[PDB]
Amino acid sequence: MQTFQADLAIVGAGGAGLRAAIAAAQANPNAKIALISKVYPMRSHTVAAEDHDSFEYHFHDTVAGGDWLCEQDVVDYFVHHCPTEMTQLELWGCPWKTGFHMLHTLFQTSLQFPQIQRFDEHFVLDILVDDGHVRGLVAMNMMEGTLVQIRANAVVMATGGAGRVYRYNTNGGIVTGDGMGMALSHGVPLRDMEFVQYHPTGLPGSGILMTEGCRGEGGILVNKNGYRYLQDYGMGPETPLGEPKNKYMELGPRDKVSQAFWHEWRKGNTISTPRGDVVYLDLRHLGEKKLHERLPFICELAKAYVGVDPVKEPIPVRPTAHYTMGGIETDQNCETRIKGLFAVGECSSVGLHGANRLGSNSLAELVVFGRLAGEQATERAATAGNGNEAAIEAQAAGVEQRLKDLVNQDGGENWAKIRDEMGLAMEEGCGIYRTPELMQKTIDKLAELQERFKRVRITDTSVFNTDLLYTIELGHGLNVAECMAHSAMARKESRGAHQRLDEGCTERDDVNFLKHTLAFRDADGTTRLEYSDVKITTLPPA
Amino acid sequence: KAFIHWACRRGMRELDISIMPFFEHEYDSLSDDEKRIFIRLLECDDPDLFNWLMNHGKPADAELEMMVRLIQTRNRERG
Numbered sequence A: 001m002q003t004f005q006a007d008l009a010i011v012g013a014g015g016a017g018l019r020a021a022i023a024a025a026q027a028n029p030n031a032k033i034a035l036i037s038k039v040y041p042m043r044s045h046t047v048a049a050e051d052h053d054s055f056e057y058h059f060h061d062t063v064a065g066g067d068w069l070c071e072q073d074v075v076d077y078f079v080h081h082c083p084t085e086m087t088q089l090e091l092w093g094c095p096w097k098t099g100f101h102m103l104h105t106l107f108q109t110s111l112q113f114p115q116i117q118r119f120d121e122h123f124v125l126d127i128l129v130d131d132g133h134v135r136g137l138v139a140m141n142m143m144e145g146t147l148v149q150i151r152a153n154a155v156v157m158a159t160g161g162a163g164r165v166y167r168y169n170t171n172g173g174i175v176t177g178d179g180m181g182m183a184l185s186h187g188v189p190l191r192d193m194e195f196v197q198y199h200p201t202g203l204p205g206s207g208i209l210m211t212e213g214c215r216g217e218g219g220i221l222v223n224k225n226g227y228r229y230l231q232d233y234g235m236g237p238e239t240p241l242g243e244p245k246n247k248y249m250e251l252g253p254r255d256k257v258s259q260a261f262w263h264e265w266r267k268g269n270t271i272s273t274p275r276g277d278v279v280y281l282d283l284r285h286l287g288e289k290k291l292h293e294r295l296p297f298i299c300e301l302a303k304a305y306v307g308v309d310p311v312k313e314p315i316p317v318r319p320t321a322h323y324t325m326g327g328i329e330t331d332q333n334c335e336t337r338i339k340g341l342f343a344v345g346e347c348s349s350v351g352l353h354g355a356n357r358l359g360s361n362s363l364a365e366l367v368v369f370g371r372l373a374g375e376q377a378t379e380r381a382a383t384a385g386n387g388n389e390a391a392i393e394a395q396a397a398g399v400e401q402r403l404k405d406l407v408n409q410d411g412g413e414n415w416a417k418i419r420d421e422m423g424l425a426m427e428e429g430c431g432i433y434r435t436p437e438l439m440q441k442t443i444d445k446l447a448e449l450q451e452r453f454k455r456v457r458i459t460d461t462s463v464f465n466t467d468l469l470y471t472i473e474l475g476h477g478l479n480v481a482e483c484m485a486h487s488a489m490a491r492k493e494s495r496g497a498h499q500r501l502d503e504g505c506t507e508r509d510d511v512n513f514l515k516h517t518l519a520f521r522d523a524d525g526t527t528r529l530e531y532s533d534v535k536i537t538t539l540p541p542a
Numbered sequence B: 001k002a003f004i005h006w007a008c009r010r011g012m013r014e015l016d017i018s019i020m021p022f023f024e025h026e027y028d029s030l031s032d033d034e035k036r037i038f039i040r041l042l043e044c045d046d047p048d049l050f051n052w053l054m055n056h057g058k059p060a061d062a063e064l065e066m067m068v069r070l071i072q073t074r075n076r077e078r079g
């Protein structure tokens, strides 16, 4: 166990973590900042991403788009610090694919700061907490096999969403919930985890995401009969072929277009395909000349992953799990219950997104709140004093043991299979619409799967195994999955991304459920729920 | 030498399906220092690796543009 004494450690080197690291280098130029990532940061999910004329119109559309589960004071902060962070990004070199341009700029800016020590290709296994205050973490160095103690008095979780918990998914296999997992291990609740958001056109089997631009440039969605079925679900009259209008038909509200898919499924109107049920995003009527100019990548994309030339046949699509509104619970400073420990970016719940993320508030949260979390954690690194050395070191030792008990564990279960059944149960029981019976089937399956998890075989693929890390991820996924399902099952209303079919729970219920779902995990392994109020300041519910 | 398995996890879901199973099903097939381009090419930006696979452009070191052909063609005979 090599060790490294830092002021702050940041777990995650995507948009949020990088912005946090720059923020901490600029706040205290004498700081040692450990910036840790299991992938070269330029491979963080943030690379993959592709009005505000008024603070009021933006605050209103975030709260309402989040169906009144937003922390309004956080929203007010956010909306008002958006222009600053956009300016600061352009100054840093970003020319005015937006997630790559963002991450590249953050990454190049981070290179100017000798305060920021990157720990590339390091897997963080646990955080060290004693007397209600974080004191560092312990990571594994992939590229060598060794384990590193990293001691800091503030730790910022920036680990990304909990996506790859659904079997069909838009996220890189990276995005496994590790940071939400670690918060749970230490009694920090996950908040509002029941609110997962789907993107309506994703490729079957893969989950690779077909851009809205497909429909902006006039592609239609039909069922098995070639019917543009969106007209049957409140989405205005059918618009002419080649003249779409925003908010109508294929450009309709993104949530209603997913729900439409589901209804078409229940009607018998889908197409049964290998690895899913699909409709068709049809682009044949554009022409390759249109398809080559605008939407140029989309052709090879379809040839490559669905084996379709979109000029000759339509593309199979279906709603895919995409963004997780919930995450580690944080206050208005991004600080968790555990003093000194922060969370920011997709892994957190700062109270910005409520029950439904609004547009590109996801990318801007990275730099607004990455800055805040960075500043705030610097502040708290300078005022924590020191900690009961034996306990910290004892805990750091316990990770070492726990990790060796894990290797050559007594068991014969296959983590691959355990992983896929969790994925299937997520799709079935926590999808577009939920029912108390499809949720309880899946709550059960997870319980069954996490028992088998206790007996998974990490075979001696040796230094330290890739198989062992994929297993630690699976564990993390499993615990956050129950948190989702338990919270969904228990939320007896329909709000934003969380939509229920059963009587009693089809309507939004502000008298009873204008509340956050906090999901704890006790040492015994069971999932405990709690609720907190929702800071309403300017905008009481409609 | 099994750490190149870890240089296969990408931020884009697209490269997980284009690079990870090609490393699995093959790689140990045509090796020697023709794998001198595999590792060399993994040390490149994720958009470039998505794009040079969709032929929205071509990589510079055309020793690496050959490797983009071997990954396209060997995968167009896969599934």
Ligand SMILES: *Cc1cc2c(cc1C)nc1c(=O)[nH]c(=O)nc-1n2C[C@H](O)[C@H](O)[C@H](O)COP(=O)(O)OP(=O)(O)OC[C@H]1O[C@@H](n2cnc3c(N)ncnc32)[C@H](O)[C@@H]1O
Pocket (backbone or CB within 6 Å): A011, A012, A013, A014, A015, A016, A017, A036, A037, A038, A039, A041, A043, A044, A045, A046, A047, A048, A049, A050, A099, A122, A123, A124, A125, A158, A159, A160, A161, A170, A171, A172, A174, A175, A178, A179, A209, A322, A323, A344, A345, A346, A347, A359, A360, A361, A362, A363, A364, A366, B013
């Ligand atoms: C998946 C996705 C998301 C997305 C999108 C397209 C796709 C395919 N398009 C978007 C768009 O057009 N507009 C938008 O506003 N959002 C869009 N999104 C969502 C958005 O991209 C993400 O929510 C956002 O990028 C999240 O970024 P964040 O900075 O919070 O985190 P990250 O990029 O996922 O990276 C997390 C980092 O943590 C490291 N990590 C994770 N676990 C560990 C462990 N255990 N140890 C060490 N490091 C860890 C990762 O390496 C990563 O760097």
Ligand SMILES: [K+]
Pocket (backbone or CB within 6 Å): A324, A325, A326, A327, A345, A346, A347, A348, A349
């Ligand atoms: K989030």
